[PDB]
């Protein structure tokens, strides 16, 4: 059992979703998300006559304001019985210390913990901006469908009508489809991040390959983001006007591993779409009596006396991240 302050990572490397589209964090002192409580977009046009001023403007009463945040509280043991991750030859005598082994093993345990919540949050993000629906579900828990409201024109499919696979691999240009799906996106699209084989049949067209610019032509901080997360986001290059990226991230589930992304999917939208990170109550007596009922995360190291007389690291959170405008992204399944 070590203090709360032993929670230093400086490792925030989420794959460009919770850090770039979903910056809009709202931890609450209350259980649910109350979209009426969030101001979101403000009623933002009307003025008043040059004699007096008008009424009082409020948070404009969101129609649906009741969903259950994913209160996730996992834990692990940091029992000093293992040989640990030994960074090359930094004096294993301190590993021989139970104190250093226990502290850096709580380091390792907790980092596994937040990357676990981060990967489940990224699955929530990919569900969110791929269908507008999120499955708040788990065993011994009712499945609540949390819908931002993704429209039908945001779910139009490439296989409908003519498929890119069922097209000329040399002369056909899918740019026409690119603006066709981008027009009904309530904004400009500046990233065309694909799943791998989706980008494969996208680039199979020649027009794509002599239309794209392999050069840097550094447009924004997206190159810096790729250099940071050189793991699963791949900056293919410029398609001229728009940036071409491929995400091949993978989640390692209970017995097997598989990619986050489905077979062939796309979301057309902006890099500055508004993403909410509403956070529920944290059900920990420590959190309430020290005021961490409204926060992002909560770690603790703590000893059980009695039957499971041991010591554990416990991580608690409650995210219900969504997208403010589901119509911002057009979600297309590809050929």
């Amino acid at each position: 059992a070590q203090l709360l302050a032993a929670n230093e990572q400086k490792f925030k490397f989420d794959p460009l979703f919770l850090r770039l589209f979903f910056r809009e964090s709202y931890p609450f002192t209350t259980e649910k998300v109350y979209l009426s409580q969030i101001p979101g977009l403000v009623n933002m046009a009307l003025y008043v006559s040059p004699i007096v001023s008008g009424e009082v403007i409020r948070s404009r009463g969101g129609s649906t304001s009741e969903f259950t945040p994913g209160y996730v509280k996992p834990k692990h043991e940091v029992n000093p019985q293992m040989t640990l991750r030994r960074l090359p030859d930094e004096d294993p005598q301190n590993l021989a210390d139970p104190a250093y082994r226990r502290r850096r093993i709580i380091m390792q345990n907790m980092r596994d913990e937040e990357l676990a919540i981060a990967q489940v949050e990224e699955m929530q993000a990919v569900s969110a901006v791929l269908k507008g629906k999120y499955t708040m579900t788990g065993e011994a828990f009712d499945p609540v469908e949390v819908d931002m409201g993704r429209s039908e024109e945001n779910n139009i499919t490439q296989s409908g009508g003519t498929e890119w696979s069922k097209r000329d691999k040399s002369t056909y240009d899918p740019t026409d489809d690119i603006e066709a799906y981008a027009l009904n996106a309530s904004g400009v699209v500046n990233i065309i991040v694909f799943d791998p084989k989706g980008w494969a049949l996208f680039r199979s067209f020649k027009a794509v390959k002599e239309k794209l610019d392999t050069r840097r032509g550094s447009n924004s901080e997206l190159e810096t983001a790729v250099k940071d997360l050189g793991k699963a986001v791949s900056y293919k290059g410029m398609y001229g006007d728009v940036a071409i990226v491929v995400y091949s991230g993978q989640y390692v589930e209970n017995g097997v591993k598989k990619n986050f992304l489905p077979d062939n999917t796309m979301v057309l939208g902006n890099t500055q779409a508004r993403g909410l990170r509403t956070y529920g109550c944290i059900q920990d007596a420590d959190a309430q009596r020290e005021g961490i009922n409204a926060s992002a995360r909560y770690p603790k190291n703590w000893v059980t006396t009695g039957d499971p007389a041991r010591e554990f690291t416990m991580i608690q959170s409650a995210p219900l991240m969504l997208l403010a405008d589901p119509d911002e992204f057009v979600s297309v399944q590809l050929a």
Binding site: L3, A5, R289, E290, G291
Partner: protein, 474 residues
């Protein structure tokens, strides 16, 4: 309440340094918002230094083989030089050019009281208005952090670069932050020069080994903060609710079953009954003018009133709570409140002189503990400069060189605040006993009186000769 303030269980140095910024920041908050810190630092100033801080040079004549008369004459020369150099009227002895020696000692002792440490730097001024090109610029404690605010490391620890044995080699001075938009850059500063020259005078009191920083204030003052808050709020509530009054209207009406049936019929389809009753009551209050005093009774149609039944009504006890706790923390922090806010309650004669003499001896303790360091360091630097400039002449029979025996040559003592007055009869009977039994020497007599035996004798010579000449009585 232990939530907003949290002690770890560890050695004090590793329990304070991680929360150094928060504790020091809330200490700044309380010393700025609260008068107690100002009064305490002012009294510490007036007990430790008082009017001035007087140098007295006593080279170890017996050990060095120096004659006592030569030592005394050399001390006369150095004392004249030091007083004339310190009395500069243009505030020019500092690099900031706005503090004399008095405020050198003032800011040094104040910061060594607040943060437990003080930082002086011996720099080479170029202003030729004085013979001595050495000034002493004081360095903020915010400056000492690891290069670029990095956390503590193996040997770079909170800004000080030490060895495994802890020996303080040097420091990383972050750039000043005034105006509030300068960036900080960390610069190397050694603690002292190899030849014994005192470049970076870092005087702090370490409570334990390996400690790098001094003592705090807030980490024992949060409780005054929250007691003053709670007494303040409870007096406000008591004052506002001694005569809070509910002005509503009730009536007889209230025919139980009939009233309930009427309300139910109104809820279903017979709201005209409620409208008629409301109209009748509005006409009632507009034909009565139901008015209590200078103000109108707030409109209450019959059948609803506030129930302002109260909580327990015992005395708050805050009286003896606050006396006990003020007592408590008063000879906690050290200076008694019967003068930090001056009560005269039931205080007696033995009370007065016992409290006064113990507190004054204890201030003598603090003075000799946290003033003589700065005094000796500054005197050593100034005397080294004087020897460089050949202002004063070292004894020819020097058993050890100046550079070798700076401690022996630069041996000095200092005199703080002036002559203590508490009772009169006390000091005078002490003086008569000492002067009759010879139990007082030149040095400790002058320490007790805040004077000098040489000057008292010369001025007594002048007294006697002027009385003889003018016709007075010696």
């Amino acid at each position: 309440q232990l939530r907003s303030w949290n002690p770890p269980s560890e050695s004090v140095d590793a329990a304070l340094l991680p929360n150094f910024t928060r504790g020091n920041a809330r200490a700044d908050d309380l010393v700025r918002n609260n008068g107690y810190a100002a009064n305490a630092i002012q009294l510490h100033q007036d007990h430790i230094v008082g009017s001035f801080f007087r140098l007295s040079h006593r080279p170890s004549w017996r050990y060095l083989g120096i004659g006592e008369e030569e030592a005394r004459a050399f001390s006369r020369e150095v004392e004249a030089a030091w007083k004339e150099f310190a009395e500069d009227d243009c505030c020019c002895i500092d690099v900031e050019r706005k503090r004399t020696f008095t405020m050198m000692i003032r800011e040094g002792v104040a910061m060594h009281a607040f943060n437990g440490e003080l930082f002086v730097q011996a720099t080479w001024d170029t202003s030729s208005s004085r013979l001595f090109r050495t000034q002493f610029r004081m360095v903020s404690p915010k400056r000492i952090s690891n290069p670029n605010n990095t956390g503590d490391s193996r040997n770079c620890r909170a800004g000080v670069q030490i060895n495994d044995s802890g020996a303080a080699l040097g420091y990383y001075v972050s750039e000043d932050g005034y105006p509030g938009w300068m960036p900080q850059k960390w610069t190397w500063i050694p603690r002292e020069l190899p030849g014994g020259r005192a470049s970076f005078i870092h005087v702090f009191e370490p409570v334990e080994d390996g400690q790098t920083r001094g003592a705090n204030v807030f980490y024992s003052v949060m409780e005054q903060m929250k007691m003053l808050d709670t007494l303040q709020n409870t007096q406000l509530q008591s004052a506002i609710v001694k005569a809070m009054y509910a002005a509503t209207i009730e009536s007889e009406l209230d025919t139980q079953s009939a009233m309930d049936f009427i309300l139910g019929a109104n809820s279903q389809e017979q709201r005209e009954r409620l409208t008629g009753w409301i109209g009748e009551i509005a006409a009632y209050y507009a034909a009565a003018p139901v008015r209590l005093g200078g103000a109108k009774v707030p409109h209450l149609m019959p059948g609803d009133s506030l129930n302002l039944q109260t909580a327990q009504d015992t005395d708050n006890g805050y009286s003896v709570f606050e006396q006990s706790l003020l007592r408590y923390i008063a000879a906690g922090l050290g200076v008694s409140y019967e003068q930090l806010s001056r009560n005269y309650a039931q205080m007696s004669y033995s009370t007065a002189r016992a409290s006064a003499n113990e507190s004054w001896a204890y201030f003598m303790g603090r003075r000799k503990f946290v003033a003589s360091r700065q005094a000796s360091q500054m005197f050593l630097c100034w005397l080294e400069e004087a020897i460089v400039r050949r202002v004063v002449t070292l004894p020819s029979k020097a058993r050890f060189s100046f550079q070798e025996a700076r401690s022996a040559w630069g041996n000095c003592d200092w005199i703080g605040s002036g002559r203590m007055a508490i009772d009169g009869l006390k000091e005078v009977q002490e003086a008569v006993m000492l002067i009759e039994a010879g139990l007082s020497t030149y040095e400790k007599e002058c320490a007790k009186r805040g004077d000098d035996y040489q000057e008292i004798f010369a001025q007594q010579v002048r007294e006697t000769m002027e009385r003889r000449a003018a016709g007075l009585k010696p």
